[PDB]
Design a protein around this motif. Sequence first.
Motif, PDB file in Angstrom:
ATOM      1  N   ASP A 149       0.792  -1.236   0.000  1.00  0.00           N
ATOM      2  CA  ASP A 149       0.000   0.000   0.000  1.00  0.00           C
ATOM      3  C   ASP A 149       0.830   1.295   0.000  1.00  0.00           C
ATOM      4  O   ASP A 149       1.262   1.776   1.058  1.00  0.00           O
ATOM      5  N   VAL A 150       1.031   1.862  -1.195  1.00  0.00           N
ATOM      6  CA  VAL A 150       1.753   3.124  -1.341  1.00  0.00           C
ATOM      7  C   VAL A 150       0.846   4.275  -1.801  1.00  0.00           C
ATOM      8  O   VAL A 150       1.332   5.246  -2.377  1.00  0.00           O
ATOM      9  N   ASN A 151      -0.464   4.154  -1.578  1.00  0.00           N
ATOM     10  CA  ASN A 151      -1.390   5.220  -1.957  1.00  0.00           C
ATOM     11  C   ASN A 151      -1.034   6.515  -1.217  1.00  0.00           C
ATOM     12  O   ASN A 151      -0.688   6.495  -0.023  1.00  0.00           O
ATOM     13  N   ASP A 152      -1.128   7.629  -1.940  1.00  0.00           N
ATOM     14  CA  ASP A 152      -0.755   8.947  -1.424  1.00  0.00           C
ATOM     15  C   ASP A 152      -1.899   9.703  -0.730  1.00  0.00           C
ATOM     16  O   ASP A 152      -2.738  10.319  -1.384  1.00  0.00           O
ATOM     17  N   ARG A 153      -1.910   9.652   0.606  1.00  0.00           N
ATOM     18  CA  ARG A 153      -2.930  10.347   1.395  1.00  0.00           C
ATOM     19  C   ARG A 153      -2.700  11.852   1.428  1.00  0.00           C
ATOM     20  O   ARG A 153      -3.642  12.627   1.292  1.00  0.00           O
ATOM     21  N   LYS A 154      -1.441  12.254   1.623  1.00  0.00           N
ATOM     22  CA  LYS A 154      -1.077  13.669   1.758  1.00  0.00           C
ATOM     23  C   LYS A 154      -0.936  14.450   0.470  1.00  0.00           C
ATOM     24  O   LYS A 154      -1.269  15.623   0.447  1.00  0.00           O
ATOM     25  N   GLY A 155      -0.423  13.819  -0.581  1.00  0.00           N
ATOM     26  CA  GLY A 155      -0.281  14.485  -1.897  1.00  0.00           C
ATOM     27  C   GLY A 155       1.124  14.905  -2.298  1.00  0.00           C
ATOM     28  O   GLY A 155       1.372  15.198  -3.462  1.00  0.00           O
ATOM     29  N   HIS A 156       2.057  14.917  -1.346  1.00  0.00           N
ATOM     30  CA  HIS A 156       3.410  15.366  -1.623  1.00  0.00           C
ATOM     31  C   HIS A 156       4.205  14.443  -2.550  1.00  0.00           C
ATOM     32  O   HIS A 156       4.839  14.915  -3.494  1.00  0.00           O
ATOM     33  N   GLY A 157       4.157  13.144  -2.278  1.00  0.00           N
ATOM     34  CA  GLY A 157       4.862  12.153  -3.062  1.00  0.00           C
ATOM     35  C   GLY A 157       4.468  12.153  -4.521  1.00  0.00           C
ATOM     36  O   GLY A 157       5.298  11.897  -5.385  1.00  0.00           O
ATOM     37  N   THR A 158       3.190  12.405  -4.797  1.00  0.00           N
ATOM     38  CA  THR A 158       2.699  12.479  -6.181  1.00  0.00           C
ATOM     39  C   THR A 158       3.299  13.691  -6.890  1.00  0.00           C
ATOM     40  O   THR A 158       3.668  13.608  -8.060  1.00  0.00           O
ATOM     41  N   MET A 159       3.445  14.804  -6.163  1.00  0.00           N
ATOM     42  CA  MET A 159       4.053  16.012  -6.728  1.00  0.00           C
ATOM     43  C   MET A 159       5.500  15.778  -7.120  1.00  0.00           C
ATOM     44  O   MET A 159       5.929  16.191  -8.218  1.00  0.00           O
ATOM     45  N   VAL A 160       6.238  15.125  -6.214  1.00  0.00           N
ATOM     46  CA  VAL A 160       7.661  14.817  -6.410  1.00  0.00           C
ATOM     47  C   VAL A 160       7.845  13.845  -7.582  1.00  0.00           C
ATOM     48  O   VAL A 160       8.733  14.067  -8.432  1.00  0.00           O
ATOM     49  N   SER A 161       6.983  12.817  -7.651  1.00  0.00           N
ATOM     50  CA  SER A 161       7.038  11.785  -8.717  1.00  0.00           C
ATOM     51  C   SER A 161       6.856  12.372 -10.123  1.00  0.00           C
ATOM     52  O   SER A 161       7.437  11.887 -11.102  1.00  0.00           O
ATOM     53  N   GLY A 162       6.037  13.404 -10.228  1.00  0.00           N
ATOM     54  CA  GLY A 162       5.830  14.081 -11.498  1.00  0.00           C
ATOM     55  C   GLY A 162       7.092  14.766 -11.988  1.00  0.00           C
ATOM     56  O   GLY A 162       7.346  14.821 -13.170  1.00  0.00           O
ATOM     57  N   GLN A 163       7.895  15.287 -11.066  1.00  0.00           N
ATOM     58  CA  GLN A 163       9.138  15.978 -11.448  1.00  0.00           C
ATOM     59  C   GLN A 163      10.158  15.008 -11.999  1.00  0.00           C
ATOM     60  O   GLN A 163      10.869  15.333 -12.931  1.00  0.00           O
ATOM     61  N   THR A 164      10.246  13.820 -11.423  1.00  0.00           N
ATOM     62  CA  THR A 164      11.176  12.850 -11.956  1.00  0.00           C
ATOM     63  C   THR A 164      10.635  12.118 -13.185  1.00  0.00           C
ATOM     64  O   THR A 164      11.356  11.919 -14.164  1.00  0.00           O
ATOM     65  N   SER A 165       9.346  11.802 -13.155  1.00  0.00           N
ATOM     66  CA  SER A 165       8.805  10.817 -14.091  1.00  0.00           C
ATOM     67  C   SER A 165       7.521  11.048 -14.861  1.00  0.00           C
ATOM     68  O   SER A 165       7.049  10.101 -15.484  1.00  0.00           O
ATOM     69  N   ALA A 166       6.921  12.236 -14.810  1.00  0.00           N
ATOM     70  CA  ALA A 166       5.704  12.446 -15.603  1.00  0.00           C
ATOM     71  C   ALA A 166       6.016  12.191 -17.063  1.00  0.00           C
ATOM     72  O   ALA A 166       7.074  12.567 -17.559  1.00  0.00           O
ATOM     73  N   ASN A 167       5.106  11.542 -17.759  1.00  0.00           N
ATOM     74  CA  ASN A 167       5.284  11.320 -19.184  1.00  0.00           C
ATOM     75  C   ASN A 167       3.937  11.321 -19.845  1.00  0.00           C
ATOM     76  O   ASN A 167       3.400  10.276 -20.210  1.00  0.00           O
ATOM     77  N   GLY A 168       3.359  12.500 -19.984  1.00  0.00           N
ATOM     78  CA  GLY A 168       2.042  12.631 -20.638  1.00  0.00           C
ATOM     79  C   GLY A 168       1.812  14.097 -20.874  1.00  0.00           C
ATOM     80  O   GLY A 168       2.571  14.736 -21.595  1.00  0.00           O
ATOM     81  N   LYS A 169       0.778  14.651 -20.253  1.00  0.00           N
ATOM     82  CA  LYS A 169       0.488  16.070 -20.404  1.00  0.00           C
ATOM     83  C   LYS A 169       1.633  16.882 -19.769  1.00  0.00           C
ATOM     84  O   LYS A 169       2.016  17.927 -20.273  1.00  0.00           O
ATOM     85  N   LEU A 170       2.169  16.385 -18.659  1.00  0.00           N
ATOM     86  CA  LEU A 170       3.297  17.008 -17.999  1.00  0.00           C
ATOM     87  C   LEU A 170       4.476  16.086 -18.352  1.00  0.00           C
ATOM     88  O   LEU A 170       4.293  14.874 -18.537  1.00  0.00           O
ATOM     89  N   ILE A 171       5.680  16.635 -18.422  1.00  0.00           N
ATOM     90  CA  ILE A 171       6.863  15.837 -18.723  1.00  0.00           C
ATOM     91  C   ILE A 171       7.891  16.103 -17.635  1.00  0.00           C
ATOM     92  O   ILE A 171       8.234  17.250 -17.389  1.00  0.00           O
ATOM     93  N   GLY A 172       8.322  15.042 -16.962  1.00  0.00           N
ATOM     94  CA  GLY A 172       9.338  15.117 -15.913  1.00  0.00           C
ATOM     95  C   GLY A 172      10.748  15.124 -16.518  1.00  0.00           C
ATOM     96  O   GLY A 172      10.934  15.119 -17.751  1.00  0.00           O
ATOM     97  N   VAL A 173      11.760  15.134 -15.662  1.00  0.00           N
ATOM     98  CA  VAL A 173      13.130  15.175 -16.154  1.00  0.00           C
ATOM     99  C   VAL A 173      13.543  13.871 -16.850  1.00  0.00           C
ATOM    100  O   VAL A 173      14.201  13.915 -17.893  1.00  0.00           O
ATOM    101  N   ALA A 174      13.089  12.728 -16.320  1.00  0.00           N
ATOM    102  CA  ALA A 174      13.434  11.386 -16.854  1.00  0.00           C
ATOM    103  C   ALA A 174      12.155  10.637 -17.206  1.00  0.00           C
ATOM    104  O   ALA A 174      11.796   9.613 -16.562  1.00  0.00           O
ATOM    105  N   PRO A 175      11.469  11.100 -18.263  1.00  0.00           N
ATOM    106  CA  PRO A 175      10.163  10.552 -18.605  1.00  0.00           C
ATOM    107  C   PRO A 175      10.116   9.089 -19.047  1.00  0.00           C
ATOM    108  O   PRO A 175       9.029   8.512 -19.133  1.00  0.00           O
ATOM    109  N   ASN A 176      11.263   8.483 -19.316  1.00  0.00           N
ATOM    110  CA  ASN A 176      11.289   7.071 -19.751  1.00  0.00           C
ATOM    111  C   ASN A 176      11.780   6.129 -18.660  1.00  0.00           C
ATOM    112  O   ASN A 176      11.764   4.915 -18.833  1.00  0.00           O
ATOM    113  N   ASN A 177      12.213   6.674 -17.529  1.00  0.00           N
ATOM    114  CA  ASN A 177      12.697   5.834 -16.421  1.00  0.00           C
ATOM    115  C   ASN A 177      11.632   5.395 -15.423  1.00  0.00           C
ATOM    116  O   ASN A 177      10.722   6.137 -15.116  1.00  0.00           O
ATOM    117  N   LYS A 178      11.767   4.175 -14.907  1.00  0.00           N
ATOM    118  CA  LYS A 178      10.841   3.669 -13.912  1.00  0.00           C
ATOM    119  C   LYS A 178      11.186   4.317 -12.568  1.00  0.00           C
ATOM    120  O   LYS A 178      12.355   4.611 -12.308  1.00  0.00           O
TER     121      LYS A 178
END
Length: 423
Positions: A149-178
Amino acid sequence: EELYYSVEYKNTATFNKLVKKKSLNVVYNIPELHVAQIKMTKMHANALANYKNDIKYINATCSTCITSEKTIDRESLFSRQWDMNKITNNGASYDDLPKHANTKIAIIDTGVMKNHDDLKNNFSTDSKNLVPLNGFRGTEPEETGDVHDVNDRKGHGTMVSGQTSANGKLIGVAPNNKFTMYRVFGSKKTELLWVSKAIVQAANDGNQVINISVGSYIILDKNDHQTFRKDEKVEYDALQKAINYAKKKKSIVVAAAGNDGIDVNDKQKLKLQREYQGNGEVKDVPASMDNVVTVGSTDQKSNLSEFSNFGMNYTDIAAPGGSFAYLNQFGVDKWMNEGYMHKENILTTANNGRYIYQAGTALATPKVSGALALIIDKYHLEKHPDKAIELLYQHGTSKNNKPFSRYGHGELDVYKALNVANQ
Ligand SMILES: [Ca+2]
Ligand SMILES: [Ca+2]
Ligand SMILES: [Ca+2]
């Protein structure tokens, strides 16, 4: 009444035998670091301290040590990522991304919305929950302790994850990395021991880049050699050791500088973060620890963000994390009705499946973690992570003579980092 105590033991076998003998209520354990958390009366804690053969140190687990995160949604309109444009030569570096995106980026934070349209393809099922049954100090009965269970209750982790890895409407720094999420928050506070265990797990799971976008101010009194202590040495030592264990496994730890606009070399100001008048010192951790890439934050003008901590022998690099200067100056009504959030805040992925504008060193840090993953993959430096750090500092920073005490090696430049062959 019982309190939560942090304990550093000397041997797994002897500590386990002692636990049976006294029926100690161990509420958390990290075998790799010989550290555990025990719930017991202050009198039993003192007594436990007399066992010099099996116990090294004991201290009450710090209550008010971790700094609070920021997820307040002060949005609808989707603007452009000026912050990414600043480090990618206005998108030109996206043409230079490695063909094989092998590096996995671990993120130690509040969890992630794994099915966010922009994050789902890159989310790794290796993600794990480090929050124990009943959460923080046993006050979260809804925390099952379910490792998946890694669901995001607070919302911070989702914000951080987008910076490293968004790959859609938003694009992170490393959009092809897991990316792999290690949840260390339920709906309340985290414990530095959970963070430490998460670091060990991230390293064991083979994530060569480990992002810690959260920090705390801890009290450490090096002059005190006692077993039972008044400082927070067990937490300090555990975190530093986890980081060195990660280094030993060839993982790079990247951490956010504190968000109080403090020169960490100004002792009076650091101590003021814990209203501490004691003998020891207050330290910004893990930002100031050994073997940590310490990331400061810059604004849309490439100047250090007003909230970013900095200092000689502290800041290693800076990346865009935004600012609230316009907001703090003009008030929310003028800031908002006039769209200043589109100029000084970072647009990122939010746990509601959409997007949010925010600012902080926590949003600068993932840009550097993403950059390291790109460096490792572009130059095939899996076996030599130190060379990836060296390349980041030498070729992954713009050369604009920014003072090292505030910007470290300079502001992050992904385009430069990916074009070393070009000369
Ligand atoms: Ca490894
Ligand atoms: Ca240091
Ligand atoms: Ca450092």
